[PDB]
Amino acid sequence: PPRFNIANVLLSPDGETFFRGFRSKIHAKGSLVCTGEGDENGVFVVVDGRLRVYLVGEEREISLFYLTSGDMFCMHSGCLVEATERTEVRFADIRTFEQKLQTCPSMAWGLIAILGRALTSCMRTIEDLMFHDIKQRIAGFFIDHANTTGRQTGVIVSVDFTVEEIANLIGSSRQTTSTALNSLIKEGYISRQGRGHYTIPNLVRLKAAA
Amino acid sequence: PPRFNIANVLLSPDGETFFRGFRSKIHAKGSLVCTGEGDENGVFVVVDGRLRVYLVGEEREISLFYLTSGDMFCMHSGCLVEATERTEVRFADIRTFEQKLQTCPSMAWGLIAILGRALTSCMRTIEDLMFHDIKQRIAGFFIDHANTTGVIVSVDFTVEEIANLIGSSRQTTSTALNSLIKEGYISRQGRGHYTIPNLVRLKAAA
Ligand code: HEM
Ligand code: HEM
Numbered sequence A: 001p002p003r004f005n006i007a008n009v010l011l012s013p014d015g016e017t018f019f020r021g022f023r024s025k026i027h028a029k030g031s032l033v034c035t036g037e038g039d040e041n042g043v044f045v046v047v048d049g050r051l052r053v054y055l056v057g058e059e060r061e062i063s064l065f066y067l068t069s070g071d072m073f074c075m076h077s078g079c080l081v082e083a084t085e086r087t088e089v090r091f092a093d094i095r096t097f098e099q100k101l102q103t104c105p106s107m108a109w110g111l112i113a114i115l116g117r118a119l120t121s122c123m124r125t126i127e128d129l130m131f132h133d134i135k136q137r138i139a140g141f142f143i144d145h146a147n148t149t150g151r152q153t154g155v156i157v158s159v160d161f162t163v164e165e166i167a168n169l170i171g172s173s174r175q176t177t178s179t180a181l182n183s184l185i186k187e188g189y190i191s192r193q194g195r196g197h198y199t200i201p202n203l204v205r206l207k208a209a210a
Numbered sequence B: 001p002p003r004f005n006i007a008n009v010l011l012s013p014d015g016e017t018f019f020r021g022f023r024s025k026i027h028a029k030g031s032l033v034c035t036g037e038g039d040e041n042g043v044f045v046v047v048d049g050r051l052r053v054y055l056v057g058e059e060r061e062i063s064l065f066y067l068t069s070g071d072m073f074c075m076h077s078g079c080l081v082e083a084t085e086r087t088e089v090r091f092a093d094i095r096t097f098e099q100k101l102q103t104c105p106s107m108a109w110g111l112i113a114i115l116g117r118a119l120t121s122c123m124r125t126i127e128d129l130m131f132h133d134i135k136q137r138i139a140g141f142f143i144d145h146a147n148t149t150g151v152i153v154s155v156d157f158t159v160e161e162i163a164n165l166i167g168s169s170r171q172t173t174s175t176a177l178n179s180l181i182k183e184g185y186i187s188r189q190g191r192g193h194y195t196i197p198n199l200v201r202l203k204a205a206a
Helices: A094-103 A105-130 A132-144 A163-170 A174-186 A203-208 B006-010 B094-103 B105-144 B159-166 B170-182 B199-205
Strands: A023-027 A032-034 A043-048 A050-057 A060-068 A072-074 A080-083 A087-092 B023-027 B032-034 B043-056 B061-068 B072-074 B080-092
Touching (some): A043 A060, A050 A105, A060 A105, A087 A094, A094 A105, A105 A132, A105 A174, A105 B043, A105 B105, A132 A174, B006 B105, B061 B105, B105 B159, B105 B170, B159 B170
Antiparallel strands (some): A032 A080, A043 A087, B043 B080
């Protein structure tokens, strides 16, 4: 789904009043906006602030994504939501929201976009599990095969190998490596500056990714 | 999101023409509709048949959910899509789909529904992965803490001890453990006392 820019609808004659009537609510920092076994429900839109959406397990907490000014979310996703700041949100029950959406279909894209954000986040988390090891292995490879340049502008860790050269070395398939590596590149652990040429920003973090 | 009934839109004067213009394509059984790296892009709606949406990973596949008549989906999810039987889809490019959605907003709920279904499927898949991992943890735990005697090999630890040592919660491990029990790989003969029938089976899980 495309990303959604809510000002487009709020500034439009049609969407301008969308939230008229929505109650307002404030969440103190560190407070749980909602969690499983939740007896609450409804829909809200962040006015300002920041909320974290996640799941937990394996001694580790999986941060899915964040909610900031303009983002919409519900109280029944089975996800945990906490304020990492004092955040204000407009609130309303599902029905009211559905009514408003049908009266102003263009606002629907906000929902579409956040469902997409939530989805890819999860895919990423699933991807991190189906490849936990190959990624540490490749993080090992990059550590063991890295070489630096003179600090006199200056200082850059490099690893010049092509995905196939890498795949051959570590063993795993070429397509599996590509995903693992592409995964690591997302996390910013490894930068790609052309085919067969990479760079390692901050080697201490990559070391931590192994 | 709510469930979506596409007939509702298609039978309405406004939505009746929604797909008027989409091309048609028959996907043979076993056929791969979407490759993890297909590169081309567009949106389709299943006419009839059934498609599988899965992800590959470290020599092994995991099924997320299936598409059947009325379901819409895209060619850029990143997920692989194979047909589990002769399936017919109506496809078009993103541009065309978005244009149609613009003039027929009500059909957007179909997009919203598939996204919710995929979201839901993924959250279930994540829960499965982690539950599967904690089990192996408890599996390997029983391996490195076996009291082979008389032969009646065993393990003398309460649920809270295994949990703490495992680096998990008394509740978490407890449900993963009892799972390992129902399946006959460990037997709980009293608090803090378990026996390991067949050690190779347990050492297999790990
Ligand atoms: C029909 C079901 C659809 C599904 C389930 C879906 C799924 C996805 C997923 C999973 C992503 C993340 C890509 C990644 O893994 O990196 C995404 C991105 C994207 N999708 Fe869709 N999509 C759909 C429909 C659409 C439509 C209708 C449009 C456009 C009107 C669209 C436009 C995009 C764009 C622009 C991106 C990349 C930019 C971004 O959002 O960050 N998608 N989509
Ligand atoms: C604001 C974004 C929203 C998100 C993130 C979202 C997410 C979800 C998720 C994950 C579920 C499955 C829960 C489970 O079974 O564990 C669900 C179910 C449901 N949602 Fe939403 N939802 C949103 C908004 C809404 C809205 C606006 C409505 C009303 C139009 C709604 C109506 C429902 C209903 C009725 C169910 C049950 C449908 C089913 O089981 O397929 N949701 N939602």
